[PDB]
């Protein structure tokens, strides 16, 4: 009954989990290390030490102060000897931090350890352990969203120093006996699996799948305003014209300063000629009081649905010492804006948080390391918001042909292999289809796999892109 | 085997974990938190 959805169905992908087997766990040799923090006091550490000593490994314990330093830890590390395994138990008993959503000691401390370790060129593959932060399906309560940031940067780390960062695990909090079942198999695994999703049953390694489109005869009407992060600067700009084609009565796309630097006279006049009575957020979204005043300043009139998470701010971060504070400073716009909207829109009438994000969050982006944590936090927020209304969403929107910060060295680097630019009207059509179906992981991007596999493989083997028929040949 | 069945019965353990991810199910639109939408199940778990 339809034959023109091809291009719309071309840029449709999804992330999911698939149960796999295991390697050949025989014997671990070395002087395996464990280090959570100065606090320690974890029976999981005792169980891990028991298992490692059972598997012919010397167990050593280390303590670390919250943001202890950058080089002294390397100084004590170089005075011990040669190690080939470290258990970063620092993610236990710290689910989500305080009011600041990125001021978590675990993240920045882990970056400090990896920096000190590459400075010491020790050569051990780091193996980190987190709590329940990745869901095997939509039928689970993601306990928090900050921990997902550890994943977002982590993949990029695998590209920066392939000799280290063995992988991650899930091991849901409580009933830690799972860590006493295999443990050695995962770390000493010849299969080279790194996105381990350990649970009550076996393992659930991450995989990437196509998103076939079962088009349905339904309709979503954008009545009144619509929530899209970013306002009119760049990504939002063209987006503002999309509803102009749709013919929405109003709009309140959230912008950094509104008329101060966004929109401008030409766009304002064109929009008013097309659709009158439309607004853009003139106040900063970081302040809770500013959002409260903006919401109180509306004329009420009309509710909406389909919360969106396109993009808010672009603040570099390709590669550097990569301290934790600068990531929070960069994301302070977007993550606190999303938190404020979630806090202030619970009692209103909408459907759910239909998330978007940059394509750099999906896999490892060497030049966009600092961009990942915000997208991971957004994904966790969407999974949490799934609890009421409508299912979640995990869009990984790519790059615009007419706008986007990633159009210089970024687009030059990955335009020779795999990815290309994408028209805006295609984005509108794909987004309309997505809101019509309301899926939970609509990765929207076009890539040429023939060179993409060769570029991504390079020196690090990966078992990720094994569910794409074109990737096989 | 029946021996494992008796061991599970004696030790008092349940065998309900979740849903299968092998049989190509959508798994995603299967539950829009409004019960009455078409194609929306209600079980977020089971024994399979």
Verbal overview:
It is classed as biosynthetic protein/immune system. The entry lists the keywords polyketide synthase, antibody, BIOSYNTHETIC PROTEIN-IMMUNE SYSTEM complex. The structure is cut from a larger assembly and holds two copies of chain A. Chain A has 15 helices and ten strands. The first copy, chain A, has helices at residues 6-10, 43-54, 72-77, 105-119, 148-160, 184-187, 235-246, 264-274, 288-296, 324-344, 372-385, 409-415, 424-437, 449-457, 469-472; strands spanning 13-17, 33-35, 60-62, 86-88, 126-128, 206-210, 252-253, 279-280, 307-308, 353-354. In chain A, strand 7 (252-253), helix 8 and strand 8 (279-280) form a beta-alpha-beta unit. In chain A, helix 10 runs parallel beside helix 11 (372-385). The relative contact order of chain A is 0.13. Chain A binds chain B through residues 16-19, 136-139, 199-201, 204, 386-391, 437-441, and chain B through 17-19, 21-22, 27-29, 31-34, 44-45.
Structure keywords:
part of a larger assembly; 10 strands; two-stranded antiparallel sheet; 473 residues; alpha/beta; globular; 4-stranded parallel beta sheet; 15 helices; 2 chains
Shape of chain A: globular
User: Going across the major beta sheet of chain A, what is the strand order?
Assistant: 3-2-4-5
Tally the helices of chain A: what do you get? Answer: 15
The greatest inter-chain interface is formed by: A-B, 23 and 14 residues
Rounded Rg of chain A: 23 Å
Give the strand tally of chain A.
10
> Can you write the helix and strand succession of chain A as a string?
HEEHEHEHEHHEHEHEHEHEHHHHH
Largest sheet of chain A: 4 strands, parallel
PDB class: biosynthetic protein/immune system
Keywords: polyketide synthase, antibody, BIOSYNTHETIC PROTEIN-IMMUNE SYSTEM complex
Entry title: Crosslinked 6-deoxyerythronolide B synthase (DEBS) Module 1 in complex with antibody fragment 1B2: Crosslinked Intra-State 1
Chains A, B: EryAI,6-deoxyerythronolide-B synthase EryA3, modules 5 and 6
